[model samples]
Target: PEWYKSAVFYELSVRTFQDGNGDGKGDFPGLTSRLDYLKNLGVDCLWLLPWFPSPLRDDGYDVADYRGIHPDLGTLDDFKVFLREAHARGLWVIGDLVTNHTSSDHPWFQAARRGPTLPDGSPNEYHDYYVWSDEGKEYADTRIIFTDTEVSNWTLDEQAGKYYWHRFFASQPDLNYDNPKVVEELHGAARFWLDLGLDGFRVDAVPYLIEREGTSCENLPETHEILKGFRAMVDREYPGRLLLAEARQWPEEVVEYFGTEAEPEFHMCFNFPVMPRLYMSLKREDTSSIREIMGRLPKIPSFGQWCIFLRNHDELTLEMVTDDERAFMYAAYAPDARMKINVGIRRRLAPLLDNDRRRIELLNTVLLALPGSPVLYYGDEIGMGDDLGLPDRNGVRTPMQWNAGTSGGFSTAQPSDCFFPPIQDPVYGFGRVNVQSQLQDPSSLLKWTARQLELRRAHPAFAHGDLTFIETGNPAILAFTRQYDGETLLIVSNFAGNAQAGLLDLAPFVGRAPVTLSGASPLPVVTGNGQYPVVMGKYDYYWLRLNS
Candidate 1:
């Protein structure tokens, strides 16, 4: 499991990865073509977003079928081939499994629409597959996830002539985990994929797995029991299989998904609160926002870990921050109505930084040195910008810009077939900023990221180490230390636009040279508290390894 302890994960969208058929939309063959690129990028695991059959509502969260891939993506055979190929390249592949709901267009939903009973007329096995009530008044307390698209927890099925509970979009009805068949179905689906040699699954919308009357109807006891049962199966057949939970709630509320310190259900969960805090920290140029939450985060199970990332395909929900902090973020980031959507600020790393390279570097340095295994969304390594002017919430999901060529080198098909157009604005033009050009430019963001990975891999201390913070008076400077069995590393970062000067106590790491990771610069080691004073350039960062 040390492989994932400090793992570098690449989150890829199969539909946007590559196009082997050249039909434009990325497919399994397209993803297969990029195995070498992934292997060379040094990713241990590839976390794929949903590729299952869907109606494309809510970006595939509405699963029409769980057992097969979407025809547009490829067939089950194609997935099997992709799985085998990925494993052959020494890569672990994990997929997103959305168990919270299924598309209303699903066959079972269709059956329910025709009548409340099955074809045999004995009883519809699929009638109770979803949460349905005689009056639809029981689950009124459950919060609606998609506030933009949904009006209530209940939507009436005209044919069935009864209201069904759906916590998200009306088209995606919630499953009834209280039913034993639901449990069996979930276990079967998980086992099927795991048996196919897939690594594991990231369970989506987990907190709302079960519901009950008279309560908020989130993270109910039934939910935990269901997950525990599923995890029990993994322990029986697959030793190292992981179940990553997507319990999108407050940090304190989210801890239960990881099971207890004695026995855990989900092996990992994204420290969802931390990502936005990172942006908040940089925007405020202080550690107050970050430190406040870290103070409250419960100690997780020793066997379980926290997965961290700077950004992802999802919106940046600000549920983790305080009212004051949220207001600050709005002021600093969401200047216009278009800039903010739902709960998250909709912008990519580069565009969010106003295309400032140094700030991006500083933020990335923080992401790398943080305690959890970091996930890198596709195209972020190149500091890709978002088209703020684009429609919908897909501005940042544009195709990866590999070169200055047509279609930004992402596809050879007709321009209209591409999922989304490559960003080509003047200030952050695709012509000048792309992977092909960056591969040759030594100082490019892609090169910087690759070099950082190489440096991180050089030291085991970077992984599984106890972290300590270095005290620097400058509010803009955020510093921390990671110490392990026999080694230590110090990460110092300037989160502002100006340089910071201060004396950092490198006393614990005395007698070892301070080797800077960015430019390979060497700083004087300290034998005492007053010995190591340093200056950091604007938006600069340092990864100092204690070299004996």
Candidate 2:
């Protein structure tokens, strides 16, 4: 909680980042070896995808063992060593925790399938670990989340002679949070990892924790109670840790997860609606959508924050948008059906922005300058592209492009054995777009991004500060102010491809001069007057500090 508000986060998947064992799959050793790279890139925290033992379905989301490390990634000892080394470099690490469901192969689930009763005729510990009903019609009000594959929320378990509930895949049955035993088991697993040096967890699918017969089974009142307990446990045991909620809901609804100042829940919640709106604004060449959404964003507890990102291991979620907005976005970003998944686009940031470096930087400018801790995807810094040819969301889940070499310096194993192939397009292929190439070029996006992060680190207002959108009559331009303590900074960005000019009301700070943060250039001084002239080039952005 101490550094999270002003920290820069890098999200990566262990199996695809780097392969240290030459086994064609990225492992803890390989990831540890690259800690220096992240530190140099200015990443303060690493949000890792699921690295727990799993059946490999759902891309490790179907965790079979929460306490053990996946054999393919490494051992428990390897994780401990990696954590220690990451901490030594002043980098924090938070692992993915899937309490919403567990793999069908999980030992507890297997035992639960044997029936609700133990051999002694008393209640069985495993039987009560999950949610099961005698009828599939229960909780019919809940909508099916995986519209592509899941036909029903209830799946009949032949072994248990009853129906089981699952929100994503049938293989991932939702745990029964109503059971106190289930809560105890989950809390134990959480403490197990936190005690072993994990900073915290990116709590997955938090909204679907509880289900009721008459409701949609999302954001239930009971859900908040349980989450608060988790927060209380962490606050009492680990004072300076954090819990980031992955609730892909609307801004207003998502804010509920971040409880209040008097009693807290999650320390942070992913701003799902803001992401889609950002893309929409760029497509429309107007800031109306983004401004409307940001204005609607509710305030959170002083200690609570938001985790913002461009893309993640999953699709660019459009679930929170209206039907018309979804259709427009699909037409604009994912013209191909293969690139679409579950009401969202599956392409990476570069490809989504059509490989325009200016537009890419513009969106990132907003992400970093907004009111939250910015989370950068693994390959976005290098402007990596996605492969639509791949099945499912695997298109954007390709290996990281570390250099212009074979397998993108991700693995030494045979191409066929590699977990995921490196991008091979002539433009975004590893041969052209990679860290090695960018590091050598001073004007590369990597260098620009690093500079932005460094500037953000120097100014705490960007992360922990209060945000106020300054009204610039031109819809093509977006302007805002971030204030923390006694320091104030002004951020302005042109979203349109054409140059724009507007009038900004600087009456609040009449005597302050604008000093650019990117460089030491001094801009026109504010006369504390009613209106000020503002001009911006196409896709241009600026971070100006206010000084007397």
Candidate 3:
């Protein structure tokens, strides 16, 4: 039930990962061919972005068919083969589940938009599948998510003679969860994937599932009820299947998605609030930003796990940050106007750090040691860069840089035929940064990433450990203790770019000796109170085990 608690997740988009049939797009066959590489990387689970059949608007988040796979990607049989191969290699897989909305061109939505009359001149029942407002005045308090493009949450539909409600984009119509038939249809769709032997799902836009008036139309009570019902169905049918919630809200509000201890909901959730803060802390050269978010996080259920990440397929969203913090992020990381998109920065982790290896490694160490299951974005290990010239978020969604070849060895097709060319910048281009070269260099970032994962897997305290913060009086040094069973691990990090020292308070473990987790070298025994001196190099961190 809690294997996800200890698993390391890797997020990859099927469209940009690898083109199997040289069709200029990644499919299940291509992804299956890369399983050996995934296994060697030491990743435990794979989080595949949506490959569902659609018009490709919203990057497949707008699903036209829930039970089918995209034709360009693969057939259902291809997915089965991929799943079988992944499980055979001891890797688990989860896919994106767009629970809040559907493509406007979906068969159900097409019928709903028209509200066609039958021979008897009566409108069909499919119109009830989506939310419609007569005057388009429902949920006015709901904030527009895509601020740069969408103006309002309601879009006028000429055929239906009414305004359809939408939270993100006009092309994605919000489903009417208030309708019992919709609940049944969506529940059946969930069963469809689980029945296919899929391990779990990362449910999309969860907080906006069911909106309410006079509120922000987020994290409403009915939304939790709808999610709980779905969770119960998974528990009853597929016992160990996971439901990872994508509610980018405050941690206090997010804990509600976990439900009560008795009636639990999601087994995991993306820690959206803390993601931007990590960058903020690094830029400011202090741990206060991260410490602030960590202090505000409410305790989750026993089975609940938070998915921590530095970057994903989408932009680096600033929704969870305050205006001041958001402004600082734009000014610091995304100086160019083109890098900004919809209240967020559109760049990968490498570019965000200006290709600084120490900064990237520092963040990775913190991400791995953080109290959550860290999700590594595709190609971030190889320090892949993004192309800001591309439209929307496709820049970060470019083809994986496998080697210095045509289309970055992602496919044999011409560069023009591929969906998007690999990053061509001189510094971080495919020719300079790729898996092939990184595989040859033992000291490469790719190899270091794998080594860190190996160290993380060896420490069970990182999985289900209790975290206790230690005050060092130095804001640049981040220190925390993790205790699980009889084992204790102490992590101390120097956020500053220069050497620093901090007096760590380890009075509780006075007689214990601290051993370096990476090399197993024992430090001096703790003999005094509040005087355990520790020296750290520039952007350095230590994973020390306290032997009691």
User: RMSD in angstroms, all models?
Assistant: 2.1, 1.8, 1.8
Per-residue lDDT tens digits for candidate 3, residues 18-109, read 89888888888998899999999999999998989999778788999999999989899999999999999999899999999999979999
Worst 10-residue lDDT window for candidate 2 reads 523-532
TM-score, one value per model: 0.94, 0.96, 0.96
lDDT for model 1: 0.80
Candidate 2 residues lying further than 4 Å off, grouped into runs, are: 119-123
Between which residue pairs do clashes occur in model 2?
A: 510-528
Model 3 segments beyond 4 Å from truth? 120-123, 212-215
For all candidates, what are the clash counts? 2, 1, 0
* lDDT-sorted candidate list, best first: 3, 2, 1
> Please, what are the lDDT tens digits per residue for candidate 2 over residues 423-472?
87898999899989999997999999888888888988887788888878
**Whole-model Cα lDDT of every candidate shown, in order:** 0.80, 0.88, 0.88
